[PDB]
């Protein structure tokens, strides 16, 4: 019912070790909570699952769906994408 990842960022050198989400929690609202750490702008972040073997699952999740449709388990890794502009 909840997961444990931790957060990269693209554009960055910072990661975030250790982040607890509902699998019930929309793409959206994680993208939220991740602008308190990392400040891109959600309109301008995609969010790529990386399981724990370093394998991608999902290069974009959709902010519609549910962190738990795309199978999220603990200690995979939730990559931001920073595509904001100049």
Same mark, same amino acid.
């Given at each position: ?6 957060? #990269? $960022?693209? =554009? ?14 929309? *793409?959206?609202?994680? !993208?939220?909570?991740?602008? #308190? $750490?990392? =400040? ?14 370093? *394998?991608?699952?999902? !290069? ?27």
């Amino acid at each position: 019912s909840v997961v444990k990842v931790s957060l #990269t $960022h693209s =554009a960055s050198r910072m990661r975030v070790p250790e982040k607890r989400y509902g699998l019930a929690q929309t *793409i959206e609202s994680i !993208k939220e909570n991740v602008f #308190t $750490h990392f =400040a891109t702008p959600p309109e301008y972040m995609q969010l790529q699952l990386i399981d724990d073997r370093g *394998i991608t699952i999902e !290069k974009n999740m959709a902010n519609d769906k549910q962190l738990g449709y795309y199978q999220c388990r603990d200690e995979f890794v939730i990559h931001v994408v920073d595509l904001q502009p100049s």
